[PDB]
Amino acid sequence: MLTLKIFVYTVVTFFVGLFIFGFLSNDPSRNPGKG
Amino acid sequence: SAWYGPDRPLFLGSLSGEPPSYLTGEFPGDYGWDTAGLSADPTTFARYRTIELIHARWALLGALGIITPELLAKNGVPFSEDGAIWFKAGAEIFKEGGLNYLGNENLIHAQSILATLAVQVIVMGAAEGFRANGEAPGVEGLDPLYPGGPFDPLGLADDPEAFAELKVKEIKNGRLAMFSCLGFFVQAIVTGKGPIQNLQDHLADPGVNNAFASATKFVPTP
Amino acid sequence: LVDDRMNGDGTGLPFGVNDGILGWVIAGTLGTIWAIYFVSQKDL
Amino acid sequence: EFYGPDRAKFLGPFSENDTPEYLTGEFPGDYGWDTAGLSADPQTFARYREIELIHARWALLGALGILTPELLSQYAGVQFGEPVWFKAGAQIFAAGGLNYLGNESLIHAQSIIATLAVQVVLMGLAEAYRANGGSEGFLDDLDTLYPGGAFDPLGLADDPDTFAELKVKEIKNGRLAMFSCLGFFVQAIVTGKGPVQNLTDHLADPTVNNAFASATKFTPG
Amino acid sequence: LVLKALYFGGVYDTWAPGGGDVRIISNPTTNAAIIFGYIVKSPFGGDGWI
Amino acid sequence: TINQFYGPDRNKWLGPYSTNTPPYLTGEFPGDYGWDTAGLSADPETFKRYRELELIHARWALLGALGMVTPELLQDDDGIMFGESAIWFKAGAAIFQEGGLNYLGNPSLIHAQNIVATLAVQVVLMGLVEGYRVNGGPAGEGLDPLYPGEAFDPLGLADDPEAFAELKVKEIKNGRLAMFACLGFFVQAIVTGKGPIENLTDHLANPAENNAFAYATKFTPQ
Amino acid sequence: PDLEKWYGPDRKLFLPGGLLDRDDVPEYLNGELAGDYGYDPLGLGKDEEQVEKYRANELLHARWAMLAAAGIIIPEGLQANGADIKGGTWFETGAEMLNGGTLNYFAVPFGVVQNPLPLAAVTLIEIVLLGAVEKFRVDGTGPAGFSPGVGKFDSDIFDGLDKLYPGGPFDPLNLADDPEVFAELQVKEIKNGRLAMIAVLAFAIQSYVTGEGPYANITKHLSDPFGYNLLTVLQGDDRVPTL
């Protein structure tokens, strides 16, 4: 169970880190318009 | 943020005053701090800059190596009683178990302090005689202070502006590590416990567990 | 006792970490994502 | 050897390429060591040479002088008030006072303030005559660092060759004596036994009786 | 609010004995671990976040 | 006259037995008795930095010596005006008393308990003060770095440069005497554990036995 | 700098822009004096002669009331924390030496010395000292000198000086030679003086109402904010609760 807990914990913090740094990676510049 | 030239930030900010003329601002970390005039001439400045940067790298390695093993001791790596506390780590070689890297008996497991010092003398003497001279079996012409080449495997030091910015990061991180190494040396003597132990005592009750509790402990008493 | 459990419920357990390796891998994984993000800068 | 472009170096083959340009080997004991670089100024370098020279000589006096009481306690059983040098001063605080070789009628000194006053005035007048380079014609000359006149009775100052290698021998023996003097000083604070006593205890078992055996003595509590 | 709890009459405590009363707060928990362990705490049963 | 203190005809750091003194010491600065056998100030601007150090230290040590003596002079017969902290090297712990640090025996004076607050207030105030000293501020922006003399001399004093120079010689000789004294206070405190005034009174009781000679056996190794 | 916030046509008035158009100010206060907020509901100013003549009395009242504010707040506080003052409270300090009971002077930090001279000597030298000073003030005639700013000045310096601002002998530390900073400090002085005048009149009415000193007022108010204020003191005794 502890091995499963460490596995789910690293999976969740990996995906949440992807979300955090993806929205930090200049997101208001992804528009297809002018401005 | 203009880390070079006359418009660089100085060691007192808005109240800095006119920096010394030899500290023009062409070298990394130039905060215009030479109040004792040690580097008026170029040669003392070059030698002192070498002492700076060599000490900076030695202190970065030192600060990480003082922080790491006692952190791992708190993590479950089994250092018994003195391999955790940095200033007592050297005393670990005399115990019946020897000196075990990461607490495992299969790792290192050293018993001869004379042998480990002798191997270190020949290795570091060759390395430092090579560093001073600027020649080795495989490298011919390299900067004595910023060598590179085989010392830059990742190609990180290529383009001059990134090189200079990383030099500023190097010198400032090194100065911070030198400051913390002075801190480790002083808190070792006056408290008698590890640096992270000092931190966790300061994290429990900072209002009383600080450096002011250990001020009266060195009063010479008749 | 008849069977082995974590018994991590309650206790005000920060981030739900009962062993330090959990906090270490959380910090380490956020650090790896930050490392790739940071080195992959000065782009676009 | 010891002079000119192929002089000996403080790192040997490792001091071939990076050497200071101010260390040209005109002076005895020159090996090229200014890694910290405290002598980029020429007259400042001259002042440090003066410091190094008489420092070496004073160290030679100390190094020979703090072996002889303990060596004489060894072998032919010479008795003292106290033989070990770092506890020699308390000899003057004993009941029998200070005696040169244990004889009550050798010097028998008890007035420590008076001997301090005598030593201060005599060595002060000696040093003042040294630094001034003589006055009113009484030795009112010489280089004040290698005098020779009225200080070299054996006359081993001629033959500029022999003077050069003898000067190198002087500074090099002095540097050995300074290194030894730091040995005596640090063994005094760490071991608390005489230099010869530490060498005697050293010959029994070097494996367990090294400097690491007292490496845990100064562990903070 | 801190000043009101420390020197301006105290605040109402239901955990004081006798049914609770208005008590003057003495020695608040300034421990950072106790303060931020509530924040880092899970919101679910047994922990309830803050 | 003033020639005793300036020019080649001045007094010397070894008197009539000093001709080989150093040639960069022309006799244009206060003090300057010719004592530079180490030769550290042969460099001109490092010499300038060293004079700045000299005068700043001189002023600080005049204040320090007169402050290390003045509480122990103002101590009374029963010892109720000040507690045990009338001795200078135990003054700081006076802020750890339940009555706090009170400037005299009356609790109406200062009455400070927060050493952290006192340290932070001192750091901020002294930072602004020394930044004004190095760069310039309300008290001056282009005055002399060592002798500003426009708000720092409100009682006139520094007129008629003939008297001004010899008064500066008084500054530097009083200062150097003070730093010699402060070195005395430190080395007396570390080897006795007694206040400087009681060192003086114990010596005035018995000068043959009450001297550092009696304390020369204190640091002996076992 | 920033002297266009106290002088000129654009300056801080006694009301902001919405409640006071700039044309509502008296014409004789258009930013020529330090502390000109255009505050004149009742026409006492008339014109510039009467304005500067009243400013003379305003400035003297200010320079008295500021020292007064310090002299009422300081020794009462010193006695309250434990100095040996015996009469720090201002409305009963005079009652100490009615029967020869001379006051104790605190030369802080080296003070608490007894003043060995009685009320008759106090008042005789007080009139002969400040009467001499005030006769000097209207005449601009001063006998001797030795001021720190200019040492041992003769009597031929007070003539030609500006009345109500006599720089030189009365300026030991200078810091007013720049007219810019001198004007800024004039505004600072007159505003501090008006503040202290309000403060000392508040001290008076607070003493008349509460029967105690203003340092006691601020200390008890900081101890119990709602339990000690004006509406608390005029209650007399408690309050019937509304339960």
Ligand code: CHL
């Ligand atoms: C006429 C002879 C004359 C002589 C010999 C000296 C000698 C000296 N002057 Mg003086 N002066 C003289 C005339 C004059 N001086 C001055 C004005 C000054 C000033 C203003 C100053 C001196 C200073 C000095 C000293 C500089 C050298 C030094 O530091 O040595 C080092 C000294 C020694 C190595 C002697 C050590 C003796 C030893 C017995 C000490 C005790 C040892 C302990 C028992 C153990 C200690 C170590 C242990 C703990 C391990 C020195 C002692 C300077 C100084 O150093 O002041 C403090 C200084 O600032 N002189 C004037 C007036 C213009 C003079 C006029 O004639």
Ligand code: CHL
């Ligand atoms: C030049 C300044 C200075 C000096 C010399 C001292 C010295 C001392 N303080 Mg103090 N302090 C100083 C400044 C300050 N202190 C405090 C606040 C306190 C407190 C709260 C306490 C002390 C205490 C002590 C004593 C510690 C006991 C002891 O024997 O320690 C070792 C010291 C000696 C054996 C004396 C000889 C000193 C010498 C070896 C060192 C001189 C060189 C310095 C390293 C120079 C450092 C320069 C600075 C700018 C980095 C000690 C003599 C404690 C005390 O009195 O306990 C009874 C105490 O409780 N200090 C503040 C904040 C307001 C300071 C601000 O500047």
Ligand code: CHL
């Ligand atoms: C270079 C000179 C020199 C040195 C190194 C020493 C060293 C010593 N003497 Mg000393 N002395 C010296 C000169 C003189 N002594 C005396 C008179 C006495 C007496 C009467 C006594 C001593 C004692 C001592 C010891 C101090 C006690 C102790 O354990 O301290 C701590 C010791 C150490 C930390 C180790 C050794 C110190 C060394 C590393 C420091 C060297 C510092 C300087 C570089 C030396 C030069 C300083 C000045 C002169 C320029 C110590 C080992 C005492 C003793 O032995 O009691 C048992 C004692 O009673 N001395 C006189 C006057 C005649 C001297 C010179 O004129």
Ligand code: CLA
């Ligand atoms: C967030 C609130 C706020 C802000 C940012 C402003 C800002 C401004 N007001 Mg204004 N005003 C406010 C609220 C506010 N007002 C309220 C509540 C009132 C009714 C009393 C007024 C009535 C008012 C008038 C009549 C005028 C202005 C004017 C102005 C302008 C400049 C002059 C000035 O300082 O006014 C002065 C305002 C005061 C002197 C009120 C006293 C403010 C002090 C400093 C109170 C200290 C605050 C303290 C923390 C209490 C807050 C408690 C809080 C918990 C509720 C300026 C841009 C002027 C203007 O319009 O220019 C053309 C003008 O004529 N205001």
Ligand SMILES: CCCCCCCCCCCCCCCCCC(=O)OC[C@H](CO)OC(=O)CCCCCCCCCCCCCCCCC
């Ligand atoms: C149980 C423990 C888990 C608790 C999670 C919280 C841990 C504490 C982190 C709080 C830091 C606050 C981040 C605010 C700025 C982030 C925006 C950014 O990123 O801005 C990005 C910006 C871009 O230039 O850079 C920058 O400003 C520099 C970024 C500063 C962030 C410092 C990170 C600390 C060390 C990272 C991991 C140690 C790495 C080890 C793993 C690596 C592989 C082994």
Ligand SMILES: CC1=C[C@H](O)CC(C)(C)[C@H]1/C=C/C(C)=C/C=C/C(C)=C/C=C/C=C(C)/C=C/C=C(C)/C=C/C1=C(C)C[C@H](O)CC1(C)C
């Ligand atoms: C700039 C200036 C200018 C002005 O004017 C003048 C002046 C003052 C001169 C100046 C300043 C200066 C300074 C600041 C200095 C300082 C320094 C330092 C601190 C160093 C350290 C430095 C430090 C260092 C190197 C450190 C190092 C460390 C090390 C190696 C360590 C090691 C180790 C480890 C890992 C762990 C184990 O278990 C133990 C050991 C083995 C032990």
Ligand SMILES: CC1=C[C@H](O)CC(C)(C)[C@H]1/C=C/C(C)=C/C=C/C(C)=C/C=C/C=C(C)/C=C/C=C(C)/C=C/C1=C(C)C[C@H](O)CC1(C)C
């Ligand atoms: C070159 C260089 C270059 C780079 O770059 C930089 C640097 C690093 C800086 C450098 C180096 C330097 C060095 C090495 C130094 C060292 C020195 C020494 C060791 C000294 C001693 C020195 C030492 C000495 C003098 C000593 C002396 C001694 C004595 C007197 C003694 C006395 C005594 C006696 C007899 C007897 C009695 O019973 C005791 C006593 C009293 C005790």
Ligand SMILES: CC1=C[C@H](O)CC(C)(C)[C@H]1/C=C/C(C)=C/C=C/C(C)=C/C=C/C=C(C)/C=C/C=C(C)/C=C/C1=C(C)C[C@H](O)CC1(C)C
């Ligand atoms: C010239 C020459 C030349 C040749 O060639 C070479 C050589 C040898 C290098 C030379 C010499 C040099 C010298 C002599 C030096 C010395 C110095 C000093 C001693 C300083 C002090 C200096 C000193 C000082 C600043 C001091 C200061 C002090 C202070 C702050 C104090 C404070 C205090 C007090 C009040 C009291 C209380 O309760 C405590 C406290 C709070 C703590």
